[PDB]
Design a protein around this ligand. Structure first.
Ligand SMILES: Cc1cc2c(cc1C)N(C[C@H](O)[C@H](O)[C@H](O)COP(=O)(O)OP(=O)(O)OC[C@H]1O[C@@H](n3cnc4c(N)ncnc43)[C@H](O)[C@@H]1O)c1[nH]c(=O)[nH]c(=O)c1N2
Ligand SMILES: Cc1cc2c(cc1C)N(C[C@H](O)[C@H](O)[C@H](O)COP(=O)(O)OP(=O)(O)OC[C@H]1O[C@@H](n3cnc4c(N)ncnc43)[C@H](O)[C@@H]1O)c1[nH]c(=O)[nH]c(=O)c1N2
Ligand SMILES: NC(=O)CC[C@H](N)C(=O)O
Ligand SMILES: NC(=O)CC[C@H](N)C(=O)O
Lengths: 531, 537
């Protein structure tokens, strides 16, 4: 018995961690020279200890925890338990979703304000009546999303699936089409009992999410609200990893080596050695070499699997459709090393201090979201590194064209655009920021052969029609699909962990069911249902 | 009336900007074209393989034109693409138009779906029963089902063009909040003649429609785009044409036409970074364009820059209203990639598969659910003594192009090799050959991702639901006290077509003449049409 784990991301490392705790031989195959996958920390040369930024995962809305690292039940409990399992609980530092001092900025339609100041951002001129403005985007979206989210939260807490069954009856809706054809405002809002216009819906998307978010599945909007802790009775502890998210996969890998990795070997084929023999082993071609395994746990993204020769893996017609149709979403990040943390110590062109510690600013300008670092803020060498832009959907697609061109002329265009946008958001001059710029690093997860997209971001119908097919194995039960796409926590580490739990669960179920009690004891009776 | 210093700055030497200059030159209106790159044509982009023959090129962007019928003199019947046909005739290119074979001119192209291979027209179900598609839906077929849903909208829009009305568009806009998917999921009911249950299609069935009708993710964009695409494809009959030597001949011929009298020089290699009024408080303020680090002043400006490109330009002092500035961000663009491969021979025309069956393909296309999605065999040069050895091995849209894009333009040999092997493998499975049969014949590969290109920032406009009804009209109004005119194919209902760019230039110039020199309108109408879209009378 020997399990081939494809991909040394967090999902594959977690799978190996489970298999090692159960004394199951395994081997991890990784295409690159690095572990962590979309846990990717870039450290700027010539910078200080905290002059890094996380190009992928950077923030974890964990449940509350005690002094020993025991976490309350919650959406992200499995992530917290993983930290504690690895002895990392005390290495978790606060992540400030909002600024820890003065609030971050909002810059929309040329109107600048602080978060919480109640600006309308010229919405009346956009055709938003005063009643909608008074209610606000947040309350409106909560009224539409809340009912679905509460039912899904009840599923997790009460161990039911009726909430998901109801979500799936509405899975053909995008968030937009739900607002356009189904949602009617709560009578307490005192609004007309009619569906919102596209103008109003686009106003919601502008301040609620990203350009084009609402054209993807309504179910994803509901699941994101649950992941961000906008529903339920428990509160979240926003955390990040001291030194960058890379510490998590590096710590797991070091744990596994003291007891295994095939690096620099990209998988090009997966299939049964002989599809007609019932006891046929799996064959993985990686780095031009054939490797045999009893079972294979794949954590490769779905678009990557579409580049792998899966003949003799005997996918059924639904599984093969799912690999193509289950939708991914894009994302870009731009990190800038400055000479100082001007957002914390500086002032705008009028002498007003920014007074920002951690937190984020938002704008309809191309950069969309600015994320100020929470790590190291209280040390004697605070971070000088800013996430100048963090984009999703259309905003990331458009910005991606200026990233990774390899041409200085477009690198200069990109920097000038980002600094110009930053200047407008914070009310400074361009040169004030240019004089302080040291280095720029940019990344497009939608222009990366190892991800082929930032993460799963399902369109309408994906969850109800195609998602379950990939939780069934292929290759006569010997190929198991895992990775964050195989979860209801897309674009989160916990999604990858859930997928690894289910894949190993199915592996143990068909090969050594006597290990299930210990599996349940160490890693949970269920992937998602709360303890 | 018109000031003596009138001069229109045209931003972008693509087909929209070249057409604008052609109109203005015919009306004796001074202009100047500012272009960021060292080439003209924009998304008319022909790649010539150096080691190949005369017809060893492929069009990375525009390549096929569903024109109306035409007579021997180059007079085109009324139709969606008449404006394109007349442009060809105006430039003396009518006889340089050669057939474009949308379907193969000999044996049909291939379909390869769910591991089942068949020829177009053979009536295969591609294992759809295993997918849960009942026999009634299969017997009807995807094409008839889609036509039943799209037909009513398309017929109303065609009636608009022919009868010179807008009720068809107004009715389309009543449904513009629908994506194609949400329309099928929540509104469409099958025609009683189909004998199907009077219920909305399931997601499984809708995804079956998208699989064979368009591209992965197409149906999540606006229903209106699906309707407008069916109209553009001619669903009067169309004469599919392409341009001998590649689509680059069209913009090259316009540039030569504008240059004949020794003037109308183009400002090349000058990327626009700012557009605005010199003094937004003065009513007579001229426009200022900063391009290549130089300030240039114009009375009016016609922009053909893509909407995502305008979002990288400093538009302070252009005084866009709140709707216009929202439109620049939200009006959605779509992706596309193409992969051209020079082979040693036109094996699709002369070769045979692993079982000895000849492909016998001349022009036309093959389709598959594999990553390459669409294969396009060349129609140009097929009858000459040196036919093309160049294949469009992959032409993708939406999700298929987004995924494939990650393998294009990486700059690393290892990913160039991965890409080639994937493409050849897909091609081998589509045509029923082995990988090595195609590898032995491969000479050179060229790949392009219009969604990773600073000059386009997307392949073309591909609006989401609500874009046409909410934000589209805002950009047909000028900005900058009437002196900034938005043009380019995004400013049309023929997105992803040359005619869209031409329509946008007509409307922009029409608005310029309307506010600056109305005496030129009769000649403008005479030479370039009384309306942008309405059929000629
Ligand atoms: C921009 C951005 C931002 C965030 C996030 C993602 C992104 C892209 N996420 C999500 C989180 O990063 C993600 O869900 C998981 O890291 C995914 O882990 P997997 O193991 O599923 O895949 P992942 O892609 O990480 O790992 C797959 C592995 O397979 C390898 N591989 C690829 N092709 C191969 C081939 N052919 N052969 C062999 N190996 C191959 C890759 O190199 C990689 O090592 C996140 N999460 C969170 O909790 N908090 C957050 O704040 C964020 N934010
Ligand atoms: C892959 C693919 C395939 C097709 C098509 C497109 C694509 C991408 N099309 C659509 C057609 O190609 C397209 O609609 C028009 O060529 C667009 O012409 P525009 O003038 O609107 O823009 P276009 O993008 O062509 O021109 C804009 C110009 O502005 C320049 N520019 C950009 N940024 C600038 C800056 N900052 N400053 C100055 N200049 C700047 C660019 O370099 C370019 O010269 C098509 N159509 C058709 O009829 N038949 C077909 O078969 C196809 N197929
Ligand atoms: N849908 C998502 O949650 C994507 C965002 C990502 N999880 C983040 O924390 O930024
Ligand atoms: N929507 C579209 O028409 C995109 C396709 C493109 N016009 C072509 O025929 O190649």
């Amino acid at each position: 018995e020997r399990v081939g784990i494809l991909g040394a991301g967090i999902g594959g490392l977690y799978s190996a961690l489970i298999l090692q705790s159960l004394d199951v031989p395994f081997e991890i195959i990784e295409a690159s020279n690095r572990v962590g996958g979309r846990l990717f920390t870039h450290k700027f040369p010539n910078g200080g200890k905290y002059d890094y930024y996380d190009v992928g995962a950077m923030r974890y809305p964990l449940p509350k925890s005690d002094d020993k690292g025991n976490y309350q039940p919650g959406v992200m409990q499995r992530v917290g338990q993983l930290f504690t399992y690895l002895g990392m609980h005390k290495q978790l530092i606060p992540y400030y979703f909002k600024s820890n001092k003065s609030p971050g900025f909002q810059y929309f339609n040329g109107v600048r304000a602080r978060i919480g100041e109640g600006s309308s951002f010229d919405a009346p001129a956009l055709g938003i009546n005063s009643s909608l403005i008074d209610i606000g985007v947040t309350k409106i979206v909560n009224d539409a999303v809340g009912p679905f989210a509460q039912a899904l939260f009840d599923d997790l807490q009460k161990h039911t699936t009726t909430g998901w069954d109801d979500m799936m009856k509405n899975d053909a809706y995008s968030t937009r089409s739900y607002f356009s054809f189904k949602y009617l405002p709560s009578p307490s809002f005192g609004l007309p009992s009619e569906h919102f216009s596209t103008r109003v819906i686009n106003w919601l998307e502008t301040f609620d999410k990203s350009t084009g978010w609402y054209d993807r599945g309504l179910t994803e909007t509901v699941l994101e609200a649950i992941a961000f802790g906008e529903v339920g009775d428990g509160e979240v502890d926003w955390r990040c990893i001291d030194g960058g998210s890379h510490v998590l996969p590096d710590t797991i890998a070091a744990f596994l080596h003291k007891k295994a990795f095939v690096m620099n070997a990209s998988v090009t084929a997966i299939g049964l050695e002989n599809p007609n023999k019932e006891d046929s082993p799996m064959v993985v071609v990686a780095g031009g070499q054939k490797r045999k395994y009893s079972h294979v746990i794949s954590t490769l993204p779905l678009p990557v699997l579409r580049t792998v020769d899966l003949k003799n893996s005997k996918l059924d017609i639904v599984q093969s459709n799912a690999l193509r149709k289950l939708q991914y979403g894009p994302s870009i990040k731009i990190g800038i090393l400055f000479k100082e943390p001007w957002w914390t110590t500086g002032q705008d062109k009028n002498g007003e201090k920014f007074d920002l510690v951690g937190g984020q600013s938002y704008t309809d300008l191309p950069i969309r979201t600015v994320v100020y670092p929470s790590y190291g803020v209280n040390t004697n060498a605070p971070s000088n590194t800013l996430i100048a832009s963090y984009c999703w959907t259309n905003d990331a697609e458009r910005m991606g064209s200026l990233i990774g061109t390899g041409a200085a002329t477009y690198e200069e265009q990109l920097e000038h655009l980002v600094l110009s946008n930053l200047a407008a958001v914070h009310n400074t001059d361009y040169q004030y920021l240019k004089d302080r710029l040291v280095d720029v690093h940019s990344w497009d997860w939608n222009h990366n052969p190892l991800t082929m997209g930032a993460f799963a971001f399902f369109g309408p119908g994906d969850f109800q029609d195609l998602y379950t097919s990939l939780n069934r194995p292929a290759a006569n039960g010997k190929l198991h699909f895992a990775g964050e796409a195989l979860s209801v926590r897309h674009a989160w580490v916990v999604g990858a962990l859930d997928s690894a739990w289910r894949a190993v669960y199915n592996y143990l179920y068909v090969t050594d069911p006597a290990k299930l009690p210990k599996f349940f004891e160490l890693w949970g009776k269920n992937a998602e249902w709360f303890e």
